[PDB]
Design a protein around this nucleic acid. Sequence first.
RNA 1: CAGUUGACUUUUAAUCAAU
Length: 484
Amino acid sequence: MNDQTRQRLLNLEALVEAGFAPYPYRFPKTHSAEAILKAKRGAPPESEWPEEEVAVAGRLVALRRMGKVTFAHLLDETGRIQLYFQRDLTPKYELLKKLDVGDILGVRGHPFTTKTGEVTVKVLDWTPLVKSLHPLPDKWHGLRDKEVRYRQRYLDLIVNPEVREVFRRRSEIVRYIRRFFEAKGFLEVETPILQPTTGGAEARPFKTYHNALDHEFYLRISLELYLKRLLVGGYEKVFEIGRNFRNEGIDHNHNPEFTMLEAYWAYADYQDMAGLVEELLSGLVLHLFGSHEVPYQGRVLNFKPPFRRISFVEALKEKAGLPFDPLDLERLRLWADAHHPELSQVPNYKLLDKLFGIYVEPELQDPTFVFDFPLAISPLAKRHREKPGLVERWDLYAGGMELAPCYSELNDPLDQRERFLEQARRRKEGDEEAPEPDEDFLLALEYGMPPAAGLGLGIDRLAMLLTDQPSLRDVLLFPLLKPK
RNA sequence: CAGUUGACUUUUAAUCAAU
Ligand SMILES: NCCCC[C@H](N)C(=O)NS(=O)(=O)OC[C@H]1O[C@@H](n2cnc3c(N)ncnc32)[C@H](O)[C@@H]1O
């Protein structure tokens, strides 16, 4: 125990001996800080409302003791509200010197405006709820370090009330997304995180052991496979907003653990789903902001429908400056190895993802559909019905990052199995990201999955745009870090 | 930088003073 910590405890003892309880069970708060401020919006200075009564409760952020009159600022959930104390008015005024900054306080009184004009709660009765054992770090010199801000988000939320509104806005996004799919005739569902075998995307899984069953399971990397099984089952419209786990590095776009949505629509193509996602995201922004304009890192992202639609091949061929057909992997190897020697030990199929990610992805700041992906990098999308080599798939980009991939689902078992067999070769060759074949899934397709359109959507990434954050850790409440 | 210490009956990164 240090000195300051001990000094706080010595003050607690004084308050306990004085008569108060050390840690009360409850406080009957009647008003919130912002509700008082909103009520007296633009009231003239030196006003009073002794008729009215209020009771607030929060944390002491400031404390300006000026002899026989004391001031303070109470920080609740909503905002800051000023307190006023006086000797021949507030009971046990002497014992206000045993309060410290950081303590949780509850007060009763009436509202009034100072000479300056700020709305203030005239304390007629106070109750020390909690005694903080450490000093509050100010915005000035305490919490500027980003990593300490993440480790102690509680401290962050005290110091920076701006951070509070980020996660509130995050919640509203989900609520809107949910209400949409709910009202659009989709069923919310829960699939297991503990899977025996993974599949749905290219990533390395997490592993874990279970004692009762005595077998090594994997953490789910995608929602697809099990939602696909429900389609086979009979459900036509399903969706889920669950946590997924990919054992990979960390950056502004990628985080090992992340929330993401997946909806599925029986007897529909990727065109049908495209119109839905347009209505979703357009209305979402229009609801949140009021315009179709999303501030993100000093840019105005235009979500006015319809969204711009480009082809994967045509866009790459243009912006990468390719004289040949990019689907030709042999010629792309030549071009790549010469122009991009860093993409030498990258496999031939992934060479498209990497090149598209360099030349095309960053230019897509506005919401842009990227229709007609290659077959090489799409194992779960039914083939294109005109151009050979491509599939019915679109990925929605915005802010120079992928939001929502949407295949037109492959329901042919024979085709699917041979793609899983192709995928199984790539793992033997040398590819950690390519998962293994789910045999039970392939069987589920054999019994017959109806033709459908599946959606994916990174909830965390969509948050970053709408909440306007640089890194992904800024839209995660408690990010993962290496302990010490 | 806070805490301590004592001052101070509309201050708002309250101020002065003491260690
Ligand atoms: N059947 C149609 C496709 C279904 C979705 C598909 N199984 C899938 O998971 N695709 S994904 O691209 O791997 O993930 C979908 C979105 O999830 C987001 N995502 C993916 N990996 C991460 C990570 N690591 N962190 C955060 N967000 C992530 C991102 O927006 C992706 O576009």
